[PDB]
Each structure stands twice: as C-alpha cells, then as structure tokens.
Amino acid sequence: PEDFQQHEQIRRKTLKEKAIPKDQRATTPYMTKYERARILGTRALQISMNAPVFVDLEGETDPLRIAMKELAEKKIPLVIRRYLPDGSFEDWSVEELIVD
Amino acid sequence: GVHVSYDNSIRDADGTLVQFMYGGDAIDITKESHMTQFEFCLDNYYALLKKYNPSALIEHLDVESALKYSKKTLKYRKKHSKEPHYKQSVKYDPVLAKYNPAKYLGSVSENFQDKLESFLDKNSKGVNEKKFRALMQLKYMRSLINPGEAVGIIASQSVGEPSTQMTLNTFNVTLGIPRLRE
Amino acid sequence: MDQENERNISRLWRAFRTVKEMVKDRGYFITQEEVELPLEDFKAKYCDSMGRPQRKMMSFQANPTEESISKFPDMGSLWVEFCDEPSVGVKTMKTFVIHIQEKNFQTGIFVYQNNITPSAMKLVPSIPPATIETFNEAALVVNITHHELVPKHIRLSSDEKRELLKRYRLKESQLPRIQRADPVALYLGLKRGEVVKIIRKSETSGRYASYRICM
Amino acid sequence: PQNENARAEALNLANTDSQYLTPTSGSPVRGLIQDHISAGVWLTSKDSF
C-alpha cells in the first residue's frame, strides 16, 4: 500500500541530502590511481559481456587493452562516486577527471 | 581500516578521525624522492615539463589563490622568527590547513616552501625563476598521497619489517625490539 | 637560617607568575609588566617586613580583554585565590564558594598548598553556573606550555568549532580526544565539548595544525 | 586471478614496476645484483673499444 511509498520517499530524500552538487564539490580533479584500475577493470568486464565499444579496436583481442584505449580518448561512459566518510558523495565523470 | 579520505584526512574505517593530513603535508613517501633535488630538476627542466604537463591542466585547478595566501604566511612568519613557539601569534594558520593541496596550486607545506626559496635565492642560473616555481609547485601537487591509500597497513609494515633486521645483541639503554615492545 | 624563607619565596614567585601566565593565556587582561615581575619587586609588594610571604594581597580579579569578548561572548570575571592555610578544611572552601556566588564571579581559581579535604572536594560542583578550579602550587612552578614538546594550544569558539566540523563533516565524538584532567586542558580550563587547536612542528612539514576535542 | 577486476589491479597497482621505491624511506629496491655490476665496470671502462 502506501507504507512502501512512505519509505521510498524517505530513502530518496536521504539520498538527496548526500549528493553534493557540481558547483560545490571539493575533492581532487585527478584520477587517483584506484579509479583508473577500477574503471579499466569494470569497463573491460563489460566489453567481455558484449557491451557497445566506442573505439576502433584494431585486432586487439584483450578486453583490458581495449579499455585502455577507450580511456585514452575519453570514450568510457562511467561515473565515479567519491564517498566522503559521513556518507555524502560527489559524482565525478570519467571525461572530466585528469588521468596521471 | 586507517586510510586516506578524499578530503586528505587520515580516518579509521568507522570514521573516527586520526589525522588531518598524512605526515603534515600529504606526500607519498614513494614520490618525494627528487622533490627537494632542485638541481636535478633544473637540468632536466624541458624533459620534466612534459611529464608534469601544465598546458592541458590549468583550467581545472585554481592557480592564483593559494599563491596569494602563502606570501602572507611566509612574510608574517619571517617577522616573528625569534619569538618562541608559545609566543607565536596564530593569525595565519598554514596554507595546507586552508586549501586542498590537490586542488589549489601553490598550497605547499612550509618546509618545502622555504627550501624552494633558499634554492632560488642562493643560485643565479632559458629558464626564469617564475617558471621554476610553477614547475616545482606542480611537482608537489602531482606527488600527493592518493585517497583510499592504505596508510595504516603501510605504516605498520614499515615498522614491523625492518624490525626483522634489529634482532642482534650488544655490539644502559633498552635496545631494539624489547624497547619497541614497550 | 634563611635558606628556606628565601626559597619558599622562589617556589612562590615562580608559581605566581605562572598563574598570571595562565590567566593571560585564557584570554583575560593581564599587562606585560605584571607577568615579567622580578623577584626584587615581588617581595616588596606581597611579602611583609618579617621576610615571610603573605598571600592575602596576592589574590586578584581578572577581566576579559575586548578581543576575547568578540570571540567568547559569555566570559565573566575570574577570581584567583591564594590560601594561607596549609591544609584546606571544609569551612574555608565555604568562604570561597560563597565569595564566588555572592560577588558573582563566573570562574574561581583556588590555589592551595598541601591538600583540600575530601569533604571540601564536594563544594566544587556546588555552583552549577560557576566553576572552581583548584591547583596545588607545587605543580605551578614551571609553566608547562613553555616546554619544547608542548605545542601552542588555542581553544576554539563555537563560531569556528562549527566551521571545523562542517569542513570535515564530523560528529563531535569523532575528533581526537583530550582528557578532562590533562595538564593543558586544566591549564586552559576546558569544559567538555570544546575543541582546542594544536599547531605543532612536524619533522616533515614544519608547522602543522591539528585539532583535539575535550570529552 | 580470475576476473578482469583483478587483472586490471595486478597490472596497475600491484605490478613490479610500481614497486620500484619502497614505502619505508623511498629507497629503490630493484636493480642488478652481482655480475652485471662487475661487467659495467669493464664495459663502460676506457679500454673498451
């Protein structure tokens, strides 16, 4: 009944008081060594499961080496969510981060 | 569970804060190896400029801000140089305590700042001094500890591993590992 | 013969300067000429003709500076009290407990010599607005904040305690803790839940600002 | 290891090339040991034509 809607409304409002907006986030604009290992991990784990690839793969059979080529041209469609230690988070996309 | 957070603080896994910066200045040990070797960086300026490439980098991080605040705190500290530590007036807290090192260019620990001044002042050498600060203050920014780094484990391994090297006897004071067990 | 009448004064002149250093560090108004008072002058103002020390004239009232008022609004008067009795009974606290509460001092310091009675130690929380802070004068010979291993503790008003906790997104109990009976927490006179700020010199970085809460 | 979230992290985080400097003092821990040392003293010598 409505007792679900009383709980979903709380869950998403609580998830609205943790989202820091794009003008007010105060973490680093760099891709911090662990995003890059997990972005190339997760994107290669998608390409091996028939994801749409946005790079001209030229005979590269390794799924991890494909993701390393989707990263160099900013073609990876992922979003990092940086958790601050009270729970609140900043959503940094992969195109706007700066890779090492 | 002690790890660097995204605000450079050193916090336990449950959130109970341990430190506010790693070491005082949030530098990885495996990055500060040539950080004060200023003579090596001036020789290799053009080769190190396109490692720390500032051209595709400056519109994402603030340049003018922490340079302005550092020269307040530098000159003001040069006033009260002979006053003792308990009479130090605390108008100007350090620039790392106000500005994120990985976001504001020039926000630099006060010990790296003085060594860079003491190199540029005591040495007159197609490189200016404005473009050597802006590389060595970019090298500082690209040599910071990353968030999520397991500094709790690394600090506990860097003590426990070279204590497999001090097991020996007198070649008074409690020596070696039984002092470290206390 | 005067190897102890002369040396009880040196144990008292140093303890008197430390409390005036302790009061000025808490933000009250002490001039510099009163802190740096030479031993030649202390005898001629607080010791009698007999050469002995008398402590009734040593006790004084401290008012906050105008600069501490814009930082801490609610900061009243401080009454430092030296006691001429070696063992403090229970009816001489009642002199000082009433003298705080009648005259309306917000804070009273009761410097004693040997001990205060455990029957008289119940009169410390006996005033719920006003605090009584007792120091044994043997522990006041050396101002511990001048030591090299002790950094500059500065206490934060809630206008910047709150701005501390908003930057780092902290509950108050997640800060590093300083004890209620720490030798520097008793120095600054910290109530519970007051963040003190520590600026210490790292070997790596130089001046490094850290924080620590009193619980 | 058995998935691409672990191949990516043995190639980028725990590989030997990133472990060049130790975290205890920043000293390098990888280099040639016994007989490569005693050949560069002959190869980079001034008799070596």
Side-chain angles (χ1 to χ4, degrees):
Chain A
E2 287 84 0
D3 302 336
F4 176 72
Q5 190 65 41
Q6 295 176 357
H7 181 75
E8 178 180 3
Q9 181 181 0
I10 287 173
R11 183 181 67 206
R12 296 176 64 192
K13 182 180 73 69
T14 307
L15 188 142
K16 192 177 179 180
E17 295 293 327
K18 287 184 177 181
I20 298 170
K22 191 182 289 292
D23 52 352
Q24 292 179 355
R25 73 261 197 98
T27 57
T28 176
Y30 285 140
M31 185 177 288
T32 67
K33 178 192 282 187
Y34 296 100
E35 284 89 358
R36 184 185 182 273
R38 189 175 174 177
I39 288 165
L40 299 180
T42 299
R43 179 64 180 168
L45 197 69
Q46 289 180 354
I47 295 166
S48 65
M49 296 291 286
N50 289 315
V53 174
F54 299 112
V55 70
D56 290 330
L57 61 93
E58 294 166 348
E60 183 68 37
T61 64
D62 194 2
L64 182 58
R65 293 289 185 270
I66 296 168
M68 294 181 74
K69 193 176 179 182
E70 287 184 354
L71 184 63
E73 296 173 349
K74 302 295 184 180
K75 298 291 181 69
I76 290 177
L78 291 175
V79 166
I80 300 298
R81 175 170 284 178
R82 284 178 154 94
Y83 286 110
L84 297 181
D86 56 348
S88 63
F89 54 85
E90 307 179 0
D91 290 336
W92 284 88
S93 68
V94 179
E95 188 178 3
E96 63 180 356
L97 291 173
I98 309 164
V99 180
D100 293 325
Chain B
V2 176
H3 66 280
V4 185
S5 172
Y6 279 103
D7 57 1
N8 299 320
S9 64
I10 304 300
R11 289 171 189 256
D12 196 356
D14 56 353
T16 66
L17 188 141
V18 178
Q19 290 184 352
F20 290 92
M21 282 191 180
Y22 182 64
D25 52 1
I27 302 169
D28 196 356
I29 291 97
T30 66
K31 296 283 181 63
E32 57 160 358
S33 197
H34 289 89
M35 195 179 66
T36 60
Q37 300 292 113
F38 297 114
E39 180 70 29
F40 176 76
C41 297
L42 179 63
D43 295 334
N44 294 109
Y45 176 74
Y46 300 101
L48 203 63
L49 187 63
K50 62 174 70 175
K51 179 181 186 290
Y52 295 139
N53 199 1
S55 181
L57 194 66
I58 42 91
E59 70 269 14
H60 295 170
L61 58 98
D62 195 1
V63 178
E64 302 287 328
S65 298
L67 296 176
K68 172 170 66 180
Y69 184 74
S70 297
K71 294 190 285 185
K72 288 179 179 290
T73 63
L74 176 62
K75 182 177 69 67
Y76 181 76
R77 180 180 50 168
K78 287 183 179 178
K79 295 292 193 293
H80 302 84
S81 299
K82 296 296 181 183
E83 295 294 326
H85 64 88
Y86 63 96
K87 293 188 178 72
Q88 281 290 105
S89 63
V90 288
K91 288 176 68 70
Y92 291 148
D93 48 358
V95 64
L96 299 176
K98 302 293 285 186
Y99 296 96
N100 199 7
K103 179 62 177 66
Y104 291 97
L105 180 64
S107 66
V108 157
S109 68
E110 287 179 350
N111 199 359
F112 185 77
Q113 185 177 4
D114 297 338
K115 290 180 182 176
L116 180 57
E117 301 299 322
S118 178
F119 176 74
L120 291 164
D121 291 330
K122 298 196 291 184
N123 291 112
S124 299
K125 292 174 178 63
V127 178
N128 293 117
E129 295 182 357
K130 290 287 185 181
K131 66 176 72 171
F132 187 75
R133 298 184 190 278
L135 187 61
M136 296 304 292
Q137 287 172 351
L138 184 62
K139 175 168 175 60
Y140 188 86
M141 191 172 182
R142 304 288 289 273
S143 297
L144 296 173
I145 192 75
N146 285 318
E149 186 76 29
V151 292
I153 293 296
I154 292 168
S156 59
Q157 290 177 355
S158 301
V159 172
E161 196 274 331
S163 68
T164 61
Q165 192 177 358
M166 56 177 65
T167 187
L168 59 98
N169 201 5
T170 299
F171 303 96
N172 195 2
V173 187
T174 301
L175 296 171
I177 303 166
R179 176 55 183 158
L180 193 60
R181 297 173 78 92
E182 289 180 354
Chain C
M1 182 177 68
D2 286 329
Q3 71 182 2
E4 288 182 353
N5 196 4
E6 179 67 27
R7 285 184 177 90
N8 283 317
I9 295 169
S10 179
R11 265 78 62 89
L12 188 61
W13 168 59
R14 285 181 285 167
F16 181 73
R17 186 182 180 183
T18 302
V19 177
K20 280 186 173 180
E21 286 176 349
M22 184 167 74
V23 169
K24 185 176 181 179
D25 284 334
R26 291 189 183 186
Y28 294 100
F29 179 72
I30 307 298
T31 67
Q32 190 60 44
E33 299 91 2
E34 291 182 355
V35 175
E36 298 190 356
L37 185 64
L39 179 58
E40 292 172 347
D41 296 328
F42 176 74
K43 301 176 287 189
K45 191 183 290 183
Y46 300 104
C47 296
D48 58 354
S49 67
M50 300 295 172
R52 72 179 65 252
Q54 58 182 354
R55 293 177 173 90
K56 296 295 181 183
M57 194 177 285
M58 287 170 64
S59 181
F60 65 97
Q61 176 189 357
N63 292 323
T65 64
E66 293 173 353
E67 193 174 4
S68 297
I69 292 168
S70 65
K71 183 183 284 186
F72 302 102
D74 290 331
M75 182 181 288
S77 299
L78 176 64
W79 179 252
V80 178
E81 176 68 29
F82 293 93
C83 183
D84 275 324
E85 296 185 358
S87 179
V88 175
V90 70
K91 288 192 174 185
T92 59
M93 286 295 290
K94 292 177 73 68
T95 303
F96 178 67
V97 168
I98 292 172
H99 178 69
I100 284 177
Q101 196 167 3
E102 195 277 332
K103 194 69 177 176
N104 193 3
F105 290 104
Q106 188 184 1
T107 309
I109 299 169
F110 186 76
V111 178
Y112 64 99
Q113 298 177 357
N114 291 317
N115 51 3
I116 299 173
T117 309
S119 298
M121 291 306 293
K122 294 303 292 180
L123 295 176
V124 172
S126 64
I127 308 99
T131 64
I132 299 170
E133 296 171 352
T134 65
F135 289 92
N136 194 357
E137 68 182 2
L140 290 172
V141 180
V142 170
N143 192 4
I144 65 169
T145 60
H146 297 178
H147 196 80
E148 286 185 351
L149 295 178
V150 178
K152 181 70 173 177
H153 293 82
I154 312 102
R155 60 187 287 261
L156 300 181
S157 69
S158 67
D159 290 329
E160 69 266 11
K161 174 184 176 181
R162 184 179 55 83
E163 297 297 326
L164 174 63
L165 302 174
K166 189 176 179 180
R167 179 187 286 115
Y168 294 98
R169 290 175 179 87
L170 284 165
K171 295 294 188 290
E172 297 181 356
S173 65
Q174 290 183 353
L175 279 168
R177 192 189 179 191
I178 187 169
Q179 286 288 110
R180 173 64 165 82
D182 212 21
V184 190
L186 291 178
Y187 182 84
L188 290 170
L190 294 174
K191 274 80 173 176
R192 290 182 179 90
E194 293 183 355
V195 179
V196 70
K197 176 173 69 178
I198 292 98
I199 296 172
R200 68 262 196 100
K201 291 183 74 172
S202 177
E203 295 291 331
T204 299
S205 66
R207 282 172 59 249
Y208 165 64
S210 178
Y211 299 90
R212 193 175 282 270
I213 195 174
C214 185
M215 286 294 176
Chain D
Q2 301 295 318
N3 53 356
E4 298 292 327
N5 280 322
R7 290 186 67 244
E9 296 184 353
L11 277 164
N12 298 317
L13 294 178
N15 57 356
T16 62
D17 300 338
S18 65
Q19 302 296 321
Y20 180 78
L21 300 181
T22 192
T24 305
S25 67
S27 296
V29 294
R30 298 182 74 250
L32 305 180
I33 181 165
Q34 287 183 359
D35 184 62
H36 303 100
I37 304 298
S38 186
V41 71
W42 278 102
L43 193 145
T44 62
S45 174
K46 200 178 284 183
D47 278 325
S48 296
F49 295 100

